[PDB]
Structures are given as structure tokens and as C-alpha cells.
Design a protein around this ligand. Sequence first.
Ligand code: FAD
Ligand code: FAD
Ligand code: A1BNR
Ligand code: A1BNR
Lengths: 443, 443
Amino acid sequence: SHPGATASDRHKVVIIGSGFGGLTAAKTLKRADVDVKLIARTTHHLFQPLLYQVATGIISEGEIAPATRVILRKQKNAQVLLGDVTHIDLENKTVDSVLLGHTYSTPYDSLIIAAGAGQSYFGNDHFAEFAPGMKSIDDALELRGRILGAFEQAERSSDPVRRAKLLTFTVVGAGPTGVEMAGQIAELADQTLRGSFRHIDPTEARVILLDAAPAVLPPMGEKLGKKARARLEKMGVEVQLGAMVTDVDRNGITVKDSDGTIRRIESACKVWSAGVSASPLGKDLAEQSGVELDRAGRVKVQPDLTLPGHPNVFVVGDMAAVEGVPGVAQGAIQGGRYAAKIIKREVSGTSPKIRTPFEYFDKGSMATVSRFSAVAKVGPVEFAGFFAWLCWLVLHLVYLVGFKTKIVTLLSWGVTFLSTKRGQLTITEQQAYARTRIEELEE
Amino acid sequence: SHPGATASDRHKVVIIGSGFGGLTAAKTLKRADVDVKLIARTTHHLFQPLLYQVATGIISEGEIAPATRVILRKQKNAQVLLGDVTHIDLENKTVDSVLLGHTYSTPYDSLIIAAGAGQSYFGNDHFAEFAPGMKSIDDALELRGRILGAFEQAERSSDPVRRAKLLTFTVVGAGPTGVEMAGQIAELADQTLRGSFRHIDPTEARVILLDAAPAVLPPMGEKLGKKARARLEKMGVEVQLGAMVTDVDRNGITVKDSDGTIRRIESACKVWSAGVSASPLGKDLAEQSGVELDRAGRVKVQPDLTLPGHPNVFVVGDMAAVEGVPGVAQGAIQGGRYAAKIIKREVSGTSPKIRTPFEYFDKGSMATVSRFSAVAKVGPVEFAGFFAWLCWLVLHLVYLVGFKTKIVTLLSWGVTFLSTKRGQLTITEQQAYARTRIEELEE
Ligand SMILES: Cc1cc2nc3c(=O)[nH]c(=O)nc-3n(C[C@H](O)[C@H](O)[C@H](O)COP(=O)(O)OP(=O)(O)OC[C@H]3O[C@@H](n4cnc5c(N)ncnc54)[C@H](O)[C@@H]3O)c2cc1C
Ligand SMILES: Cc1cc2nc3c(=O)[nH]c(=O)nc-3n(C[C@H](O)[C@H](O)[C@H](O)COP(=O)(O)OP(=O)(O)OC[C@H]3O[C@@H](n4cnc5c(N)ncnc54)[C@H](O)[C@@H]3O)c2cc1C
Ligand SMILES: O=C(CSc1nc(=O)c2ccccc2[nH]1)NC1CCCCC1
Ligand SMILES: O=C(CSc1nc(=O)c2ccccc2[nH]1)NC1CCCCC1
């Protein structure tokens, strides 16, 4: 019923989600002759690459989660809206969303859908009670809560087996996020806490990195994978590969490896970085358009990112199963910019008879292992180590919104890498447990 | 029951609370021939004076809330412990505390009880779900959530009555915390949000400051209070005085004026800051020592801050009632330092035969009204305005732990006072509502 947005007499663009793709399309429409609505679940534009830093106390929330209203402040075309999209209608041309129990059904003339993707438990979906996967500010603070709270519990225990259980951290998945987390948790336990405890030595903590994949960083090949693994192993991370999780609980994890030697890992704190799963909005799209979903539910968009039959509805970023395009920032940014350019060209009436296919311009990739250690690959060139870690820090630091935010980031890196001192090192029990306990109570 | 700490043959000092008093006693014992055990509900040392700034997005946690365990890193005889004190035994000489379902029974030879005092609802405790308190990082993040989320709900709402209800913020109590909160919420809606919204104008936000007291900042007297009120009214805050709350609900507040006429404030977001209420530990002391409690439950400690009949058990800081001594930082700091020096002498010998009474050396007070405006009083002088606000900023800034933290604070003040924008404007519905919904579900 309620449109939940300002009225319009121009071509109406509705953008779903406010991460990279959606925000890039919004910025790209800044002087197009269209009215833009941007509907997203959260006020902030989460700079997910650095999420492991706030998850490990290097950086604050406001360095990585700028308010979208401040970014689009001057863009008179664009109204930002809070809300969770409940449903999308391809025939009535409405987006149906909820906010604190109020329902809004915003009309559109074209869509950019950038709802993205998150981790996947491969159907063992109840594991989310015991092993969160970050990918949001809430989940990153929940992880920071657990990873410090384990040491705080570990001092107050006469039981050595309980201490061993608390001081063993398990990271599942050897994708970029898993190597990042196992790296920072190992640094945190080795160097930041080194003198701050008196019943235990945090340097005796174990960090275990589990994946069923045969190699670390599958998309970067054998050389960079082996070098990253050797760096993690030199840091003392126990890298276990070819081990598939069979069960997860509050006390530990059971894994079965390729030889079938079922075993258990006792481990209080567990991080689930593995897999991918697209936004459920793909289901409503599949039902209305008949578009295919791949495994993990990504929409098999047409060569112009449209749905079959409903042109000028675009799916972009990690929600789209574009052929060969990796699930990385520059893919969302290019997809959103492409869709935006299409809409601008059509509204101005300069549309060609056929839209040229989307071409992903591959601008390379990078992953951090730890302080002074990253890996990179640019076309035929592969490099690793300090020069890489510099080329990562510089690349991300270029993107952070606002000059102050960059400066305070650079100060926080300065101290955290040159000295054994994290900022932001505050647990709150509310944030460490609210999600799991409310899940336990919502019955 | 478990001794939740390492044993020792030394004289054993237990300290309760990471706040000013207890941490100052801990730091004061750095060379005493005692082993110190500091039990606190949370890891951080919460610098509450600035808590309104994080509650209004100027600054982050971990800048305001250093980890106590890191502050004492070098103090080889002091062991920090996480936990909530459940009970204290004056005859068995144990402190009994719980952490995540485990229970501990730490013995003490001397005790520094320095747990805080919070707000009070004067027995209308069923207000707490509708008017959150303050005095924790979680309360500050909750208020930041409900504040910005009111504007977020306000843009989508079609009904003018509902927009008016959402855009009216009510602050209860005109102590320092109330004047701070009404000030920042008014300036934030007048400046930081100005023009960031298109269905609404944030400069139409209505901020109401309620107290039943007859004057603003009553402990500074009329000459400062009238100037502070005139500054609040010049910013357009509606100061209402002599109005006592009769009921509070999710939609508004009903108040009775001093004329006895009854009237209602329709207001979505409510901040509670009136009154004071000591932490319940005073009750167990009152039942064991028989010490009197004031109307706020504060312990009427003896002239040496001891409990009657239990020497070298000290109640100190805001939990302690001492005549004249106000509930402010320097009082907790001076008390804790006094009690620590008593312990140090008694253990080292060459103590006087009778302890000299505690004398509060009054080092003045001051309160912020808003940007470029504060009120102060030092003995006979009563300076106010920009020169005050500078004194405020420089004073507090002196205390923040670690030089980096000061620098990044000063940068955040720089940007947010010289320009409209704010750094930490990040919120989540978990942060805004987790306690509300879990309490609604814990029955
Ligand atoms: C820990 C981590 C580290 C990463 N590091 C890197 C890296 O270093 N480099 C890299 O290239 N990629 C990295 N990625 C992946 C990268 O973030 C994604 O490939 C890409 O950013 C996808 O973003 P997007 O633009 O598709 O939207 P996303 O940023 O994924 O989010 C889409 C938006 O939609 C919103 N939304 C979700 N559901 C709804 C709904 N129902 N209704 C409305 N709005 C909704 C979300 O809140 C969000 O604002 C990382 C991912 C993670 C989890
Ligand atoms: C909103 C606000 C504004 C303020 N403004 C000013 C100001 O302008 N100027 C000024 O000088 N002072 C100000 N203060 C300081 C405050 O008013 C007190 O005067 C002062 O902080 C006293 O603190 P404390 O040292 O007694 O311990 P607190 O900091 O009050 O807390 C004691 C410690 O005990 C812990 N604790 C609590 N319960 C338990 C338990 N059951 N078991 C174990 N540990 C427990 C708490 O977590 C905390 O770490 C302000 C405080 C607040 C909340
Ligand atoms: O190969 C690359 C990686 S592009 C990239 N990465 C991101 O994390 C990112 C995050 C948000 C938005 C855009 C992003 N784009 N950069 C080259 C220079 C450095 C060495 C390798 C070659
Ligand atoms: O009036 C004062 C206020 S003292 C003070 N305030 C705090 O907030 C505080 C917080 C934590 C620890 C100690 C603190 N101590 N100081 C005089 C000099 C400046 C001009 C006025 C007179």
C-alpha cells in the first residue's frame, strides 16, 4: 500500500542493497534524468575487505561503515531508504520491504539488484548457532567478543582441559577471509596479549585452519598458495587440508578427512568462513522469470545482466552468476557501473538497437596473510611478501571514505604493526551473545 | 568452590570494579608488598564523561574504553579478572562471583569495594524498556541506534502524527548527563543531519528536556544554571522544569506539572538520566555489617571509609555516601588512593596508631552545554562559555589513555566542531534493540 518514498514523475530507478554495486550505480546516476530509490538493510556501506580488522580490534566501526546518507548527501536525485526487502514483483513493478513491522511497496521502472551473498554451511544450517561467519558489523563484533572472551574465561579455570578447549581457535575455510582470520587471531594471541595474562601464556594458544579444499587460496594457484601456507605454518597456524566438517557444537568440531579417519577437535571458538550463498531474492526471481540459479543460488543473468523476459531489471555483483567473473569488489563495481550506464543511455534516448555485452575488466586480486606478508597476482605477474603487503594496504587505504578516516586508519596501522598494541579491544557480553541467546529464546 | 585466581602467601587485596576508584587503588598499589586481584563486570575502564559523545557518534569505544587488562600489563603483582560479583562474605572473607555460568570464591585479606552507582527510576522500574538508561557502552550504542533509527523511520512514515512522534526526543533529568544528551541530540539534528533527508527536515526535530527539579544543574546554583538554560533555549531545546513523570510507554510520556495539571508528551525516543541508585552490593553489606544506607542505597561509611566492625574492608567511590563529597570522578579517585595508601602503610608498617580521616580536596567541576558552550565553577569563580568549553576539552583530553587515543580524539573533535559531519554514525538493529527484545523474550 504505502509507497514508502517520495513521489515521482520521471523514470523511477529502485536499487536494492547499498554495498559496492548498488552504491556505484547510485553514484553513476548522479546527473542522469532519473529518480533513484536505494533500499538497503543497513545505513552503512560496509567496506567488507577490512572487516577482519574490526573483527580483531585493529580499527573501529566508523572507519569501515560510513553512513550512506552522508555519501549520497549532495545527490539530489537519490533518496536513501532503510528497509529489508521482503518480496519483489516483476509484473506489478513493486519492491516490498519492511521496517520495524511497517510494510512499504515502492514502485519501480527499473531495478538494480545488488543483494550480494554470504557464507554457506552446505545445509548443516544449524551450525550457525555455534560458528558465525562475520560478513556484517554485528557478526564481526560478535567474533571480537568471543575471541577475547575465550582468554578471559581461560584465566579463571583450574581445569587444564577446559583451558586447552578455550585456547584453541578453529577457522573453517581456507578462502581469503579464513587466512585473514587465522592470521590475525594468531598475531593477537602471539603478540598483543603477550604480557597481559598471568595464569596462562597466550602464546600457547592454538589456531587451526580447516578446509576440505586441497589447497589454500584455490583461485591464486599452487605457488602463491604454497607460499601463503608456509607463512601461516611459520607463524605456527596448524593448516589442515582435505578435512570436511561432519558436526559442530559448542564444545568442538568433528572432521572427516580423505582417509575417513573421523576425529574430533575440542575448540570453544569457531569461525565459519567457508562457502557462498546468494541472497534468497534469487528464489523469487527464479519463480517469476524462470531464470536458472546455480548452486549457491546465484542468478544466471543474461549477457546484459538482465533477467530473461524482464529487461531493465538488472542483477549485479555477487548475486549474479556471470560466467568466469570472480566474486570480488571490482566485479560488483563494474556490474553496477555497467547497469547504470545502460539506464542513463536509454533514458537519454541514445540507446543502441542492441546493448553490448558486459565485459569484466580483470584488475587483479590480493590477499593478506599477516603483518608484512601478503600475496598478489596481476595477469602474468605474481609477487608475495612485504612489497605485496604494502601494495594491499595502499590499495584499500585509497578506497576508505573521507580523508580523516584514512588518517586515523593509517595511525591505527602505524601503532598496531610497529607496536604490540591494538585499539578497539573492548568486549561487551551483549554483543558477544545476543544473537545466539535470542535465537535460543525465540521459541 | 573454585578460587578463581592464583593463590599466594602474601597479603591479599581484592578490588571490585574497573572504574576510577578501584583502578586508581590498583595503580596506587604498584609497589606495595601485596598481591592485588581486581574483579570487574567488563574488561574496559569506561571513561564515562565522554560517553555522550559515543552515544552521539562523535567518538568510538576503545577510545573512551581502554582495556583494563592492558593498563595494568606491567604491574607484575596485579591480576585482573573478569566476572560479576554475586555475593560478598564478611566473615568467611570471600568474594563470590560468576562468569558465564562458572562460580568462584576468591578470598581476601583486605577489600576495596568500588562498584558503581547507576541511574534510578524511583521504583517505576518498568520504565527501563521504554526509557533506556545510560552508563555503559551498550547503553550508548543503544541510544545511538534509537536516535538515528528514529529519523530513518521518520522519512518512510506517511502519517504526520507518526513523523511528529518519531522526531520528538525526550530527555528526562537535567543533571550533567541530561544537558549533555539534549545538547548533542539537538546539535546533531540541527547540523550533522541537515540536508541528509528529503521526505523530512531534521531541523524540525523537537528535543524536550524534562526534570522535576526546579533548576538546571542544581549543584552549580542559579548563576550558571540560568546561563546553561538560556543556551539550551537558544538552541531551541524546550526546557520544562517542575514536571514529574507519572508514566512512560513506547509511544510517549505522561507528566504532571507543579500546578498538578496532567499532560502527555508523545515521543518515540526517551533517554533516562534522573536520580542515582547504588549497586546492590550495599544491601549485602547492610545485612552483614549493619551499616546504614541512604535513600540512594549508598553506604554511610565510617570516616576511614571502612565498614563498621570490619576494618580494612573499604567502600569507596560512588557507592560510598560521605557528607558533602559529590558523586564525581575526583572523589572516587581520591577515595581509592586514600584506601590504597592505608593498605600500603598497614602492610609495610610504620602506620599511625589511628588512621587520619579522609579529606576530599575539592578540585572544581564543570559541565558541557554544547559546542563552544560550557559552564564551570572553581571556588568563587564561575566562568562560562567558549573559554570554559576549551577548559573542558583540555581537561578531559588530559585523561584519555595512550597518546594515539588523544590524537585521534582531537582529530575527531576537530572535524566535528569545525564541520558538520560525524565519524561514528554507524548503527544496527541488534545494537538498538537486543536488550528490549531479549527481555521481552525472557519470560
Ligand atoms: C570477510 C570478507 C572479506 C572480503 N574481502 C574482499 C577483498 O579483499 N576483496 C574483494 O574483492 N572482495 C572481498 N570480499 C567480497 C566482496 O565484498 C564481494 O565480492 C562484493 O563486495 C559484494 O558486494 P556487493 O556490492 O555485491 O554487495 P554487498 O556488499 O555484498 O552487500 C549488498 C548490500 O545489500 C544489502 N542487503 C542484503 N540483503 C538485503 C535485503 N534483503 N534487502 C535489502 N538490502 C539487502 C546488504 O546489507 C548490503 O548493503 C570479502 C568478503 C568478506 C565476507
Ligand atoms: C553519563 C555520565 C556522565 C558523567 N559525567 C561526569 C562529569 O561530567 N564529570 C565527572 O567528574 N564525572 C562524571 N561522571 C562520572 C560518574 O558520575 C562517577 O562520579 C564516577 O565515574 C565514579 O565511578 P567509580 O570510580 O565509582 O566507578 P564506576 O566507573 O561508576 O564503575 C565501577 C566499576 O564497577 C564495575 N561493576 C559494577 N557492578 C559490578 C559488580 N556487580 N561486580 C563487579 N564489578 C562491578 C563497573 O563495571 C565499573 O567498572 C559521569 C558518569 C556518567 C555515567
Ligand atoms: O589486483 C588488484 C586488486 S583490485 C581491488 N581490490 C579490493 O580489495 C577492492 C575493494 C573494494 C573496492 C574495489 C577493490 N578493488 N590491484 C592491483 C594493485 C595492487 C597489486 C595487485 C594489482
Ligand atoms: O573543575 C574541574 C573538574 S576536575 C575532573 N573532571 C573530570 O571530568 C574527571 C574525569 C576523570 C578523572 C578526573 C576528573 N577530574 N577542574 C578545575 C580546572 C579546570 C577548570 C575548572 C576547575
